[PDB]
């Protein structure tokens, strides 16, 4: 006999994210075999962990994947990156590209620096991560009072620096209208501890490539659409 039904108040509604399927109109069809394929990946996090380039500003305000250093120790940081997946600095990194499609993140961030100067060039940098609350570090004295690692040049070319996940909340926002304590987490500044030093016949300026990616315990969640824009 027919079953009595109570039509809910949302009849006919199309839920773009309902966790259910719809009617198949061309079933019993074989999906063209692709067993020969390679390169498949199943988690978008894989992408977030691939170190990608940061956009630094050239002397002519042009965007370049590195910063310069020479035979001197500035009283100010060579570069300053605000730790937000919203930083214009990492706007075109795979990390940010993926994060733009998610609401929150959690975990470590890896800032990879690759020294491209000559083999004869030496020097030491102090990479610091300053948590918020007391503002951006104004001096080396302040920067070294927070989380930091000293990078010494030599045989190995790069330094993998991790910005520890230090937050009042378990998750942090990927973007924001105005900075809040849940969307902005401090700064990463790299200072010149000792001047880049070298012999004669070597260009005064050395270029350090800069990249970012999510660390080992980095995660993103809540799929969303980012603010649309016109390509150019």
């Amino acid at each position: 006999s027919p079953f009595p039904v109570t039509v809910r108040e949302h009849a006919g509604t199309f839920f773009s994210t309902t966790p259910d399927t719809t009617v198949p109109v061309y079933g019993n069809t074989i999906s063209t075999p692709f067993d020969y394929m390679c390169g498949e990946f199943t988690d978008l996090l894989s992408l977030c962990k691939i170190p990608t380039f940061l956009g630094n500003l050239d002397s002519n305000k042009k965007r370049i994947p590195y910063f310069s250093a020479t035979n001197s120790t500035p009283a100010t940081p060579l570069v300053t990156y605000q730790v937000t997946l919203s930083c214009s600095c990492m706007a075109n990194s795979m990390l940010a590209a993926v994060a733009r499609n998610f609401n929150q993140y959690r975990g470590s961030l890896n800032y990879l620096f690759v020294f491209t100067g000559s083999a004869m060039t030496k020097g030491k940098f102090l990479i610091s991560y300053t948590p918020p609350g007391a503002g951006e570090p104004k001096t080396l004295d302040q920067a070294m009072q927070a989380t930091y690692a000293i990078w010494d040049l030599g045989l190995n070319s790069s330094y993998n620096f991790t910005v520890p996940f230090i937050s009042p909340t378990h998750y942090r926002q990927t973007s924001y209208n105005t900075p809040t304590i849940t969307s902005v987490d401090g700064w990463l500044t790299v200072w010149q501890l000792t001047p880049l030093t070298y012999p004669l016949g070597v260009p005064n300026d050395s270029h350090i490539l800069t990249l970012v990616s999510g660390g080992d315990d980095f995660t993103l969640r809540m799929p969303v659409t980012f603010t649309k824009y016109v390509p150019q």
């Binding site: 006999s1 027919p2 079953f3 009595p4």
Partner: peptide
């Protein structure tokens, strides 16, 4: 006669149909 449904009737047999009873 014209009973071709697999699943049992939703309504009790005593409600769906008249109750047949013998007076003897």
């Amino acid at each position: 006669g014209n009973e071709g449904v697999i699943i049992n009737n939703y309504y009790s047999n005593q409600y769906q149909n008249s109750i047949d009873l013998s007076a003897n």
